[PDB]
Amino acid sequence: CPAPELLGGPSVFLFPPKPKDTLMISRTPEVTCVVVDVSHEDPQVKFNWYVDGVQVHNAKTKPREQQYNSTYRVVSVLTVLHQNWLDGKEYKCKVSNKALPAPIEKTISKAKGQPREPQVYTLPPSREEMTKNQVSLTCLVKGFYPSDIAVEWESNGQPENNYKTTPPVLDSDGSFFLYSKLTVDKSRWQQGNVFSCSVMHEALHNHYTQKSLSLS
Amino acid sequence: CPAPELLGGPSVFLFPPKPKDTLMISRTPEVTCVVVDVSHEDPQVKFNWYVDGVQVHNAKTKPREQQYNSTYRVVSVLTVLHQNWLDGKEYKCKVSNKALPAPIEKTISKAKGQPREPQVYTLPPSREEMTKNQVSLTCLVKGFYPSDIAVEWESNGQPENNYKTTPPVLDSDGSFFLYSKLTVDKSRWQQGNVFSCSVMHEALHNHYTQKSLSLS
Amino acid sequence: DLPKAVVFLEPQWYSVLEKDSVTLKCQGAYSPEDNSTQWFHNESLISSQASSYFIDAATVNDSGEYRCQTNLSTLSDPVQLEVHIGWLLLQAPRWVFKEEDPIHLRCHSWKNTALHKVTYLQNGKDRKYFHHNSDFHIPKATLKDSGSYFCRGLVGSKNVSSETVNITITQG
Numbered sequence A, B: 001c002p003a004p005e006l007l008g009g010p011s012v013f014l015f016p017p018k019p020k021d022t023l024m025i026s027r028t029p030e031v032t033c034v035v036v037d038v039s040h041e042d043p044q045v046k047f048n049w050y051v052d053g054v055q056v057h058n059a060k061t062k063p064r065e066q067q068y069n070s071t072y073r074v075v076s077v078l079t080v081l082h083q084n085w086l087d088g089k090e091y092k093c094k095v096s097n098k099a100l101p102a103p104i105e106k107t108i109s110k111a112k113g114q115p116r117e118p119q120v121y122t123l124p125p126s127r128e129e130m131t132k133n134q135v136s137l138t139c140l141v142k143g144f145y146p147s148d149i150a151v152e153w154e155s156n157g158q159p160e161n162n163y164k165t166t167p168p169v170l171d172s173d174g175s176f177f178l179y180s181k182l183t184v185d186k187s188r189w190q191q192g193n194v195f196s197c198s199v200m201h202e203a204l205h206n207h208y209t210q211k212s213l214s215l216s
Numbered sequence C: 001d002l003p004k005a006v007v008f009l010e011p012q013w014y015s016v017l018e019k020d021s022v023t024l025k026c027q028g029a030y031s032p033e034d035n036s037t038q039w040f041h042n043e044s045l046i047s048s049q050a051s052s053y054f055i056d057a058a059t060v061n062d063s064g065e066y067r068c069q070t071n072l073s074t075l076s077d078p079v080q081l082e083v084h085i086g087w088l089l090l091q092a093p094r095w096v097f098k099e100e101d102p103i104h105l106r107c108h109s110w111k112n113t114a115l116h117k118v119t120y121l122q123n124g125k126d127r128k129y130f131h132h133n134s135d136f137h138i139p140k141a142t143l144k145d146s147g148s149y150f151c152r153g154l155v156g157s158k159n160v161s162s163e164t165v166n167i168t169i170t171q172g
């Protein structure tokens, strides 16, 4: 049945890599295991890491003690290969401590299920809005999987400050979709300056694609 | 375990009325008090409601028991006055239960700040999209406050099934803004059928505005 | 002549939570026919003529000054007592401790529910922390120590804390 959870001892949380960090080999994705509420009486905490269920005590890992409210905190960071964390290997962190009846395990993995290349379209301000001082240059990302994704905006070579983005939305179409509203002072629109939407996903050729919006 | 359940007071969550229901007098705004984790040993749960601090056990309430994982779940519906929740009266839900060394008090109300005007523009599919067999008829709501609000789509007189909406996003422009992506089979677009975005907010003359999208 | 009743609480804690239970025994000298004891609430006769007043479920109404007296015995000096409402209370015998004494802080919980990652604090500073609940001792208090204590912990997912309290380290 739904396992008996929660009885003192330090608790243990395990965080995944950062999305971006997983699509630019140039980036070091690291999965990380924390251990809070660690006594001053038994500071010695011991980790073991398991990839798709492997290497009990072997290695490739990393951790070191830390003060707080009145309790200790401890980390272990296990750098991961990109490809792995992409093919969805599973990451296991087994924590073990004097104060614990038995050890704790926490497994983190990448969005299960098959992914889907995200369609990107640009959208030029609705006439009705052309009125005001700045227009809403819109860019939507539809039908992608999974939620992880990032999007930005550059005028030509340099990126913009203003603008924001929605959280992925669960489309009936099985996948996700989001919007991104870039705001520029009226002018720039008209002048002609071109604009590009940038989408980072694990389904685009190089996890990257770009689409641009201007007046025509 | 042949089913856990347990050790702490039943906890309590209290939700507000739906935005829509708040601006259409014709609709019954209803604030809602929920109590979960309710023991099988003390299913008797007592609700007391308080309008800007009033009516300990007077009335205007409504509740009734509910099974679940292995614990009870209990509701209290408090139908409220439209203008009330508009002016910002606060809603207090005091919950009592033998399992709780004392009561629990949760209060729900509407954001501090003077309401803003819902810019609303409609957006026709990006040509680049025209290819597929269904296009994304978009309509966005910008610069409004507060987040409460709902949106819909009518073809002519009857509204549509397909379509989704993002949740409000905090715009740097102090207000809110969202998008709504209506999905119609390609044809429908070209043929000509016009299309309306429906926006419900307490800033529109009649808490209601409409804007429509068509083509050519 | 010199008789004079006496009151003892058991358990020793004079401060407690509701549904918490206590008994006040009255050590006195009985005498023919008068094998009876009288209980005073604040200054008032109350039913229970037992020899040990017993409170099963406590409650604030129950708070007050309990004194007793039997026949051949005088009238018990007062023993003050208090019921507080909450998921936990900080227990101790006295609160005014001489420079260097046996501090016994108990973080007690409503209906004795279970307490997780518990803490004894003061002035707001997390002093001592335990995983599973524990009493908190300090052999001989210290003056540096004087302050305002309380504890907090875990009732399953629920998180909780006690009403603050003042410990006073004197210079003797």
Ligand SMILES: *[C@@H]1O[C@H](CO[C@@H]2O[C@@H](C)[C@@H](O)[C@@H](O)[C@@H]2O)[C@@H](O[C@@H]2O[C@H](CO)[C@@H](O[C@@H]3O[C@H](CO[C@H]4O[C@H](CO)[C@@H](O)[C@H](O)[C@@H]4O[C@@H]4O[C@H](CO)[C@@H](O[C@H]5O[C@H](CO)[C@H](O)[C@H](O)[C@H]5O)[C@H](O)[C@H]4NC(C)=O)[C@@H](O)[C@H](O[C@H]4O[C@H](CO)[C@@H](O)[C@H](O)[C@@H]4O[C@@H]4O[C@H](CO)[C@@H](O)[C@H](O)[C@H]4NC(C)=O)[C@@H]3O)[C@H](O)[C@H]2NC(C)=O)[C@H](O)[C@H]1NC(C)=O
Pocket (backbone or CB within 6 Å): B005, B006, B011, B013, B015, B016, B017, B018, B029, B030, B031, B032, B034, B036, B037, B068, B069, B070, B071
């Ligand atoms: C035993 O089992 C029960 C039930 O289990 C059920 O089945 C299994 C499968 C479960 O896995 C689960 O799916 C089911 O519940 C279980 O009970 C759980 O307990 C949870 C906590 O332990 C509790 O979680 C909270 O959920 C809150 C969200 O509630 C909404 O969403 C949930 C689902 O996501 C849904 O259940 C609710 O109904 C509700 O959604 C709808 O909201 C509508 C809005 O009004 C409303 O609609 C109705 O009312 C309107 C009135 O206008 C109309 O009448 C309408 O027609 C009508 O339908 C209904 O309420 C809902 N309807 C539907 C269809 O969904 C969520 O807010 C809580 O999050 C906050 O609290 C956590 C900690 O608790 C914080 O960490 C977190 O930060 C959140 O904090 C808030 O943050 C916001 C900012 O975002 C801030 O503004 C707030 O101030 C802040 N508050 C706080 C306190 O911090 C929390 O997640 C869960 O809901 C509950 N189940 C149910 C059904 O309620 C037991 O726990 C189990 N026992 C054990 C021991 O486990």
Ligand SMILES: *[C@@H]1O[C@H](CO[C@H]2O[C@@H](C)[C@@H](O)[C@@H](O)[C@@H]2O)[C@@H](O[C@@H]2O[C@H](CO)[C@@H](O[C@@H]3O[C@H](CO[C@H]4O[C@H](CO)[C@@H](O)[C@H](O)[C@@H]4O[C@@H]4O[C@H](CO)[C@@H](O[C@@H]5O[C@H](CO)[C@H](O)[C@H](O)[C@H]5O)[C@H](O)[C@H]4NC(C)=O)[C@@H](O)[C@H](O[C@H]4O[C@H](CO)[C@@H](O)[C@H](O)[C@@H]4O[C@@H]4O[C@H](CO)[C@@H](O)[C@H](O)[C@H]4NC(C)=O)[C@@H]3O)[C@H](O)[C@H]2NC(C)=O)[C@H](O)[C@H]1NC(C)=O
Pocket (backbone or CB within 6 Å): A011, A013, A015, A016, A017, A018, A021, A028, A029, A030, A031, A032, A034, A036, A037, A068, A069, A070, A071, A073, C117, C118, C119, C129
């Ligand atoms: C004593 O003090 C302790 C110290 O804590 C700090 O807290 C400060 C506020 C301060 O007061 C100091 O005291 C101290 O500095 C305290 O420990 C705390 O205990 C809490 C519980 O007891 C812990 O709560 C959990 O926190 C998780 C959130 O973690 C992130 O976000 C918080 C908020 O900012 C932050 O504090 C965390 O550090 C953490 O930040 C993340 O950090 C990781 C690693 O650094 C980063 O990882 C990145 O990875 C990439 C990889 O490429 C790369 O390495 C990057 O460099 C690296 O940064 C993240 O990027 C970073 N993100 C962010 C945003 O900061 C919560 O998730 C967790 O919630 C879940 O579980 C709870 C309990 O199980 C439950 O209550 C809750 O409902 C929730 O449930 C889960 O929900 C999930 C979805 O979120 C579901 O998927 C799960 O299924 C579901 N599971 C369950 C069981 O329900 C919870 O909130 C807290 O983390 C911890 N503090 C710290 C710093 O760790 C201690 O308790 C104190 N003791 C006493 C007695 O007071």
